[PDB]
């Protein structure tokens, strides 16, 4: 009931042993009381890394999208090493979503080593299990065995109805994932451990389908974009290898489903000036001239009977002489050209009325006239060429035209393919004009280039008219164990890709949220704009060039920081060599860098002078020691990891406050939320996520089926809690419910339509479904229902929630009215109370933790000691937590080397991995999440508690308590101990 404090462990040790005499009865009692539970106590175990590789094929349907929606691929496994590195080899094949699938090396959900199907955004098929949301469900197959050498796994995905299906060795699998969210794009992905060898089969040249694709499906190799090429690449990464060494990389920009849909601008609706019958007629004449000259250059001739094979022009007249189905076609395309030009922000009309008088045409010899003769002189347009603004106009006109064409195609049902299949109603141009390659863009522009050249030749009046910050910013820093507060230090940073790089020195108190240079904590230099940032910005020197190196260096002997580029010392506007001066030591400084999307750069701390370039020019001969020179092991660094995780209420938060009033008569204990700065300057408003720190867990077995009654109180299973919404707060943007331990949606535009949901349907060999399980990361109720159920009423909205831990059902009520929304869950599941709210008044919400008649309060549910005490209580451990988007994490010292190549046309792509790697995982029981033990270096409180826990282990093991020693051998293993001794970090 009072958190994890080491002083109580000290008390327990004192109870165990004192004055060299150990009370065996007390030691056995403490051991039997706390060790067998394996809860309320930190736990560690051996794990291995898991690496996932995608096929670089993105498919997903949307409204107006060009995706086919029925895809199929195959994977072959030929080398599996069972029980490698004293752990079962991981190997899974499936599909993953582009958004939400963010694997990281080490850690993650569960105990660690998350593969595909360990998150709701991913779905995997093991040898005989279906993996979704870190949940494994056994599936029946004709051959029930794990992934083995010489095995074939066929995966087929359908988007029209949300279906994922698998097939093993030709035997179809009667377990399919259904009713999943279609937001985003889906790509193939294989997760694996060491000692694996597989080959992809994507169809066509890249792999071959040993089994025929299901009818209506298409091979995945034909979904590649025109300018894209097939190449294996990680989902996202913050590091890469290069000739100099480790090159840190920023975020990876990726396409979205909304990019596939063509979004044009309406043009035909807009009226046009009366220039159409004066000057647009001459432009149409010029187009006729140029077209006739194209045929003249070709083998075409003037034959009145139209015959493409015989090269005969139907009109066969110098003047185009085209009839209404032909002349009006030309006139209307020119008219639509002007409509598009006006719609895209430009003008239509004349500016120079003597310009067409200046135009003199180009006279050509009679050889151009062939057969009847169709040579009109090309009107010379060299008088006015295409300005860059005019070229942009041509580009936008081509975009809009191809865009309206593509939307017409999609409305007809045209679906994009890498190849051109009109019989299947598919083109390589079905992607928007922006998504086209340079060839198709050129083909859809050149004619409009001629048209705009005609426009200019006549002299026309035409004239051209929050969380994203973390998604587009990545931060790396030196570990806080190397906080130097004196001396003269040099370190170099090479920026291989030009971008908004910010490299410099930062104080140990740098918040992950604050950008570099926006605060005084870091003296950074952003050379993309060529300025230096420290609590602002100021011009400094010149921007670098792609591949330049900057020698960021500091002297606390002189209390200054300077930046040099390629051995050239950067000057300020006044000419001062030092970028900053008067820099007090304070709390010290640490190397730091900030990278943007699609950006790469090496960071050399200066460990080796031989590889330290430009040191003689910049640092040497000035008394400036290279940083980390005497380091033997590589310097450990820390990266800003973007993953939403709940964190408690900061009592010093400038905008929100939480109060804890309890013990009032006729009112249960309650936690009140207030907005400190509402109705004032800088009153930020956005969706706020809150949850209670302790969860409630359902029974492992679902073996069901005035003055409260004491027997019903003792025998009841239901639990109740309420939320009070105050007046002033709109009942529309209020939410009350429960969240799974794997909810990481930090959406500022959050909605109940954005919750993850998936239906796992299990059938038999005959195909008859017998299981219809449902999984979701959030079980919470719509706020429009509350606002409908109810000007603002002074009555505080009371939202009651009832949960049965034995039967497994969830019911919601509003102000004494029972809502129709019911929920059913599975045994052995833990849920956290949570509310999502929009600040609309000074006082908004209040958790009421109480009890009803014959209903047991949540205090019993959380606490075993109070499991039978009807009085509701709020112990200090129970706190409120909101969701932090981005935090700090520690990069691994070593990275797995997986070798992937293209074996051949028949063999597809060969992927192999045989490098072992084993770190240690520390698992939090209540939060259901794991961390590396080495990450505890910066977390001293957890380190202190763990050290005192080990001391408690020794105390209960003291004086040769051999039974307790054996019990401890179960938790703390010989291999774990040996690896801990062998560890150096």
């Amino acid at each position, epitope marked *: 009931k009072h958190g994890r404090n080491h002083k109580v462990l000290d008390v327990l040790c004192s109870l165990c042993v004192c004055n060299g005499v150990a009370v065996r009865s007390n030691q056995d009692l403490i051991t039997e009381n706390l060790l067998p539970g394996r809860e309320l106590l930190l736990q560690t175990n051996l794990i291995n890394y898991v690496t996932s590789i995608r096929p670089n094929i993105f498919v997903g349907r949307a409204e107006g999208s060009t995706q086919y929606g029925k895809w199929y691929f195959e994977v072959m496994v030929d080398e599996v090493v069972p029980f490698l590195t004293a752990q079962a080899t991981h190997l899974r094949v499936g599909w993953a979503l582009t958004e939400g699938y963010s694997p990281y090396p080490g850690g993650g959900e569960g105990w660690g080593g998350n593969g595909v199907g360990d998150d709701l955004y991913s779905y995997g098929f093991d040898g005989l299990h279906l993996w979704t949301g870190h949940v494994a469900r056994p599936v029946t197959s004709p051959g029930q065995h794990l992934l083995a050498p010489e095995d074939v796994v066929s995966c087929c995905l359908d988007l029209s109805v949300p279906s994922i299906s698998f097939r093993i060795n030709g035997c179809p699998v009667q377990g399919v994932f259904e009713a999943f969210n279609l937001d985003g794009l889906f790509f193939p992905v294989v997760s694996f451990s060491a000692g694996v060898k597989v080959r992809f089969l994507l169809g066509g040249r890249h792999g071959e389908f040993k089994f025929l694709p299901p009818p209506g499906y298409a091979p995945c190799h034909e979904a590649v974009l025109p300018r894209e090429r097939l190449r294996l690449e990680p989902i996202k990464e913050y590091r890469r290898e290069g000739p100099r060494g480790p090159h840190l990389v920023g975020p990876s920009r990726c396409l979205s489903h909304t990019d596939f849909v063509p979004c044009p601008v309406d043009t035909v609706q807009i009226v046009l000036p009366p220039h159409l019958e004066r000057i647009r007629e001459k432009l149409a004449e010029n187009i006729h001239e140029l*077209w006739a000259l194209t045929r003249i250059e070709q083998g075409w001739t003037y034959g009145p009977v*139209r015959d493409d094979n015989k090269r005969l022009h139907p009109c066969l007249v110098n003047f185009h002489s085209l009839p209404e*189905p*032909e002349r*009006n076609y030309n006139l209307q*395309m020119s008219g639509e050209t002007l409509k598009t030009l006006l719609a895209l922000g430009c003008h239509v009309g004349m500016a120079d009325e003597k310009a067409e008088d200046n135009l003199k045409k180009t006279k050509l010899p009679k050889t151009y006239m062939m057969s009847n003769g169709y040579k009109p002189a090309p009107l010379d347009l060299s008088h006015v060429r295409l300005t860059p603004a005019q070229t942009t106009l041509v580009d936008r006109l081509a975009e809009n*035209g191809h865009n309206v064409w593509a939307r017409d195609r999609v409305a007809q049902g045209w679906s994009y393919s890498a190849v051109q299949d009109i019989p299947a109603r598919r083109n390589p141009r079905l992607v928007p004009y922006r998504l086209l390659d340079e060839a198709t863009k050129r*083909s859809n522009r050149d004619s409009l280039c001629q048209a705009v050249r005609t426009l200019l030749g006549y002299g026309y009046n035409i004239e051209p008219p929050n969380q994203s910050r973390w998604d587009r910013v990545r931060i790396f820093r030196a570990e806080k164990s190397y906080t130097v507060q004196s001396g003269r230090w040099y370190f170099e940073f090479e920026a291989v890709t030009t971008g908004e790089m910010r490299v410099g020195w930062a104080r140990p108190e740098l918040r992950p949220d604050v950008e570099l240079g926006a605060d005084e904590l870091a003296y950074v230099f952003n050379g993309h704009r060529g300025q230096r940032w420290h609590l602002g910005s100021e011009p400094f020197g010149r921007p670098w060039q792609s591949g330049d190196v900057v020698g960021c260096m500091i002297d606390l002997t002189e209390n200054t920081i300077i930046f040099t580029l390629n051995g050239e010392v950067l000057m300020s506007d006044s000419g001062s060599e030092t970028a900053f001066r008067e820099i007090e030591i304070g709390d010290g400084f640490l190397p730091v860098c900030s990278l943007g999307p699609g950006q790469v750069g090496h960071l050399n701390l200066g460990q080796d002078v031989s590889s330290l370039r430009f040191f003689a020019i910049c640092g040497l001969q000035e008394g400036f020691e290279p940083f980390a020179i005497n380091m033997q092991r590589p310097v450990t660094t820390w990266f800003s990891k973007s993953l939403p995780q709940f964190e408690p209420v900061p009592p010093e938060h400038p905008h929100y406050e939480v109060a804890r009033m309890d013990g009032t008569v006729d009112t249960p204990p309650c936690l009140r939320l207030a907005h400190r700065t509402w109705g004032s300057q800088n009153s930020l408003v956005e969706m706020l996520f809150l949850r209670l720190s302790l969860p409630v867990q359902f029974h492992q077995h679902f073996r069901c089926t005035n003055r409260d009654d004491p027997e019903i109180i003792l025998n009841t299973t239901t639990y109740y809690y309420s939320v009070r919404v105050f007046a002033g707060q709109e009942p529309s943007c209020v939410w009350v419910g429960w969240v799974t331990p794997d909810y990481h949606q930090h959406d500022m535009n959050f909605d109940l339509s954005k919750v993850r949901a998936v239906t796992v349907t299990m059938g038999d060999e005959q195909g008859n479904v017998h299981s219809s399980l449902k999984c979701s990361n959030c079980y919470m109720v719509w706020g429009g229902d509350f606002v409908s159920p109810g000007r603002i009423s002074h009555t505080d909205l009371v939202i009651g929630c009832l949960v049965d831990l034995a039967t497994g059902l969830m019911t919601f009520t509003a102000n004494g009215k029972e809502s129709n929304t019911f929920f059913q869950v599975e045994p052995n599941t833990k849920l956290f109370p949570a509310v999502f709210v929009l600040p609309t008044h000074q006082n908004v919400i209040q958790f009421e933790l109480g009890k009803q008649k014959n209903i047991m309060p949540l205090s019993a549910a959380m606490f075993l000691s109070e499991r039978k005490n009807p009085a509701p209580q709020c112990p200090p451990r129970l706190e409120v937590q909101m969701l932090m988007p981005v935090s700090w994490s520690r990069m691994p010292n070593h990275f797995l080397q997986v070798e992937t190549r293209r074996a051949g046309e028949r063999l597809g792509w060969a992927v192999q991995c045989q490098d072992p790697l084993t770190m240690m995982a520390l698992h939090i029981p209540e939060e259901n999440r794991c961390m590396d033990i080495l990450e505890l270096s910066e977390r001293l409180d957890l380190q202190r508690f763990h050290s005192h826990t080990l001391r408690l282990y020794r105390a209960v093991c003291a004086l040769g308590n051999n039974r307790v020693a054996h019990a401890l051998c179960s938790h703390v293993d010989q291999a774990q101990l040996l690896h801990a001794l062998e560890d150096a970090h």
Partner: nanobody
Framework: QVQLQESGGGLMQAGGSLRLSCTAS????????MGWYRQAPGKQRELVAT???????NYADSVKGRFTISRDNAKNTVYLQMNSLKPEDTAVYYC?????????????????????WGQGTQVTVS
């Protein structure tokens, strides 16, 4: 949307009268041409004599026989009479509509890609 519905192509002895009616229902705009195509089981769709709104008829190598074509823009109806039947002539026939006129387009690839095929019908020669 411009949907072209095609009906006809009865089976009987060679030389039997076969008239195919295709009507193009859709936006009246960009309706100036009318193509025809034939593909036999297992071979490509070659162009039939294509007529455009100005009653401009373009023949090809596959017009061997009688292929009387007659169109009408009053209700976007086109009748193709391949009343001559030959063993090679057996094919699925399709009717196509497009803005491109007289099989040419100074505009370029957009309008070119602006094709609107139809449901078609089957023709067999016995």
């Amino acid at each position: 949307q411009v949907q072209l519905q095609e009906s006809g192509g009865g089976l009987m002895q060679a030389g039997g009268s076969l008239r195919l009616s295709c009507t193009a229902s859709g936006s009246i705009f960009s309706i100036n041409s009318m193509g025809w195509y034939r593909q036999a089981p297992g071979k490509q769709r070659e162009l039939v004599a294509t007529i455009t709104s100005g009653n401009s008829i373009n023949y090809a190598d596959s017009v061997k026989g009688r292929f009387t074509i007659s169109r009408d823009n009053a209700k976007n109806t086109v009748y193709l009479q391949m009343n001559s039947l030959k063993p090679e002539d057996t094919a699925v026939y399709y009717c196509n509509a497009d803005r491109v006129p007289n099989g040419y387009n100074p505009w370029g690839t957009p309008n070119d890609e602006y094709d609107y095929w139809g449901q078609g019908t089957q023709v067999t020669v016995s």
